[PDB]
Swiss-Prot record, chain A:
It comes from the Bacteria. Sigma factors are initiation factors that promote the attachment of RNA polymerase to specific initiation sites and are then released. This sigma factor is the primary sigma factor during exponential growth. This is RNA polymerase sigma factor SigA. Interacts transiently with the RNA polymerase catalytic core formed by RpoA, RpoB, RpoC and RpoZ (2 alpha, 1 beta, 1 beta' and 1 omega subunit) to form the RNA polymerase holoenzyme that can initiate transcription. Residues 1-35 are annotated as: Sigma-70 factor domain-1. Belongs to the sigma-70 factor family. RpoD/SigA subfamily. Coiled coil: none annotated. It comes from Thermus aquaticus. Contains 4 domains, connected by flexible linkers. In the active conformation, the domains are in an extended conformation, each making extensive interactions with the RNA polymerase catalytic core. In the autoinhibited state, sigma-70 factor domain-1 packs closely together with sigma-70 factor domains-2 and -4, contrary to the extended conformation that is seen when the protein is part of the RNA polymerase holoenzyme. It is found in: Cytoplasm.
UniProtKB/Swiss-Prot annotation, chain B:
The RNAP catalytic core consists of 2 alpha, 1 beta, 1 beta' and 1 omega subunit. When a sigma factor is associated with the core the holoenzyme is formed, which can initiate transcription. The gene is rpoC. This is DNA-directed RNA polymerase subunit beta'. Signal peptide: none annotated. It comes from Thermus aquaticus. Belongs to the RNA polymerase beta' chain family. Disulfide bonds: none annotated. DNA-dependent RNA polymerase catalyzes the transcription of DNA into RNA using the four ribonucleoside triphosphates as substrates.
Length: 114, 226
């Protein structure tokens, strides 16, 4: 039964306290703006390294493997980018990890208020 | 974990099956834990100084490094700590030990150190002269339990010996963090002067380092161990 299914699937996680809420939004926005400052780093665009964050977070190649026969090139437009900022000093790297944790925060947030 | 209760375990410390992380908290698995939404932080600052002092040689314990409670001198009877200068005093009294700043007008002429059992003979601001009775030690007169004496000094004149220390104490102060705030510094970190401690809703509600010291996170809202 697919209805009561999601009914028990949502209650599988607590919602949030004001604290947790504000914290979530905190690391979210800090992460995204970290992505901004990162866009100023290697000359990458605003939305580019963002979806790339999803490339190395939301899973393995499964994300862009089948978004239709055309969405956006994985081995070309993504791969090199994944390796282009790996060569970079402490500042750009800390901004990187900030991006990661931030997007994850977005997710958790979403589920509660889901 | 209930509001206000602290964690008897330090942050990021391996805990064991059934082991106590708090009065009522039981960890049923082996692994490392972490603080989650702490409600307090104790920042213990350090303060230096260069201060002279004197007491008979039949007293002086004759040590360089005086540990927090390392026994100080001997002192046949209640020797009077005698002022070598005139100026308004400052009673800085800290735990068992007292400190006295001698300044005329504004500028300080000199600062004197008063270990345990050495009592102030004048309230702060009250004028003192040279040779004027300043303190009284008796018997024990040992070093404070939170302080440390670095770089001993040697000056010998008659019965009463003169000596100076760079002794640097600790001035701890805590802060109660709020839901609209978040910690910017790691547990057990060594802060700089005016270091960012906790970022808040308003940039003003934040906390900086009073002078310089160590941050200890406490009263976590809960603790998670993997």
């Amino acid at each position: 039964d697919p209805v009561r299914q999601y009914l028990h699937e949502i209650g599988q996680v607590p919602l949030l306290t004001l604290e947790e809420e504000i914290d979530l939004a905190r690391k979210v926005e800090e992460g995204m703006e970290a992505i901004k400052k990162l866009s100023e780093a290697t000359g990458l665009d605003q939305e580019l390294i963002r979806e790339v964050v999803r490339a190395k977070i939301l899973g393995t190649a499964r994300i862009q493997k089948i978004p239709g026969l055309k969405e956006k090139p994985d081995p070309k437009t993504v791969e090199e980018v994944d390796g282009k900022l790996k060569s970079l000093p402490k500042e750009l790297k800390r901004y990187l990890h900030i991006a990661r944790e931030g997007e994850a925060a977005r997710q958790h947030l979403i589920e509660a208020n889901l | 974990l209930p509001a206000g209760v602290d964690a008897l375990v330090k942050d990021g410390e391996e805990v064991v099956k059934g082991q106590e992380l708090a009065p009522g908290v039981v960890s049923r698995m082996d692994g490392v834990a972490l603080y989650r939404f702490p409600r307090r932080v104790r920042v213990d600052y350090l303060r230096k100084e260069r201060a002279a002092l004197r007491i008979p040689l039949s007293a002086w314990v004759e040590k360089e490094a005086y540990r927090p409670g390392e026994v100080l001198a001997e002192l046949s009877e209640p020797y009077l700590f005698r002022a070598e200068e005139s100026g308004v005093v400052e009673l800085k009294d800290l735990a068992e030990g007292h400190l006295i700043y001698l300044r005329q007008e504004e500028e300080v002429v000199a600062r004197y150190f008063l270990p345990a059992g050495m009592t102030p003979l004048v309230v702060e601001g009250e004028i003192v002269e040279v040779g004027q009775p300043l303190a009284e030690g008796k018997g024990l007169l040992r070093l404070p339990r939170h302080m440390t004496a670095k770089e001993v000094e040697a000056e010998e004149e008659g019965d009463s010996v003169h000596l100076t220390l760079f002794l640097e104490w600790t001035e701890p102060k805590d802060y109660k963090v709020a839901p609209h705030m978040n910690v910017i510094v790691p547990e057990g970190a060594k802060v700089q002067a005016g270091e960012k401690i906790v970022a808040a809703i308003d940039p003003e509600e934040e906390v900086i380092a009073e002078a310089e010291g160590v941050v200890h996170l406490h009263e976590p809202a809960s603790i998670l161990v993997v």
